[PDB]
Design brief:
It is built from 7 helices and 7 strands, in the order βββαβααβαβαβαα. Helices cover 33% and strands 16% of the residues. The strands form 2 sheets. A 4-stranded antiparallel β-sheet has the order 4-5-7-6. It has one domain: 2-Layer Sandwich (Muramoyl-pentapeptide Carboxypeptidase, domain 2). The chain binds zinc ion (5 copies). The site of one zinc ion has 2 residues, from loops. The site of one zinc ion (ZN) has 3 residues, from α4. The PDB classes it as hydrolase. The entry lists the keywords hydrolase, L-D-carboxipeptidase, pneumococcus.
């Protein structure tokens, strides 16, 4: 399968499910505002509960859906200032964040910070797929995904997550769609 332009977004047909694509190559449209995906949200709750039961200090609170308009403001504040290059490196241009899909969620520690502690991060690599999630921005896959590695950013893909995690690949590499940096 190859990506299809469906106007509001590009998507690719996975083994079980349609997979919406949002990255630095394929933006979502300005008007695409699906809010939080309920299926993803219900698995996230379970994921968090299982982390907490394994003893990790993980908050119930998370960063989920973020609209184009909110991302616009957020990206503008970052160029404002840390400059446009720090914005591109650490923020995301509006339309180009997976958070606008409603399928991406950042897990947060009860210490108030995005999860970076090594054992919790590896739990996510090992187990996020049990809840249909993948760790999107893998270590070492910056050229493929376009994004600096993030231990805490999870993307809901559903049943195919286990095969994806076992491959060690980015979604770009796994499904065969384009990634990389902003073309500009
Ligand atoms: Zn639209
Ligand atoms: Zn439309
Ligand atoms: Zn597991
Ligand atoms: Zn790090
Ligand atoms: Zn994120």
């Amino acid at each position: 399968a190859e990506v299809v332009n469906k106007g509001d977004y590009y998507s690719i047909q996975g083994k079980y499910d349609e997979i919406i694509v949002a990255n630095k190559h394929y933006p979502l449209s300005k008007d695409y505002n699906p809010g939080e995906n309920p299926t993803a949200k219900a698995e996230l709750v379970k994921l968090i509960k299982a982390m907490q039961e394994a003893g990790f200090p993980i908050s119930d609170h998370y960063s989920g859906f973020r609209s184009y308009e909110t991302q616009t403001k957020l990206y503008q504040d970052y160029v404002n200032q840390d400059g446009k290059e720090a914005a591109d490196r650490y923020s995301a241009r509006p339309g180009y964040s997976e958070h606008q899909t409603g399928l991406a969620f950042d897990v947060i520690g009860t210490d108030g910070d995005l999860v970076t502690e090594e054992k919790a991060a590896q739990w996510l690599l090992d187990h996020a797929a049990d809840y249909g999630f993948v760790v999107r921005y893998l270590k070492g896959k910056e050229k493929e995904t376009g994004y600096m590695a993030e231990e805490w950013h999870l993307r809901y893909v559903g049943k195919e997550a286990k095969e994806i995690a076992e491959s060690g690949l980015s979604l770009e590499e796994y499904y065969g769609f384009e990634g990389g940096d902003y073309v500009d």
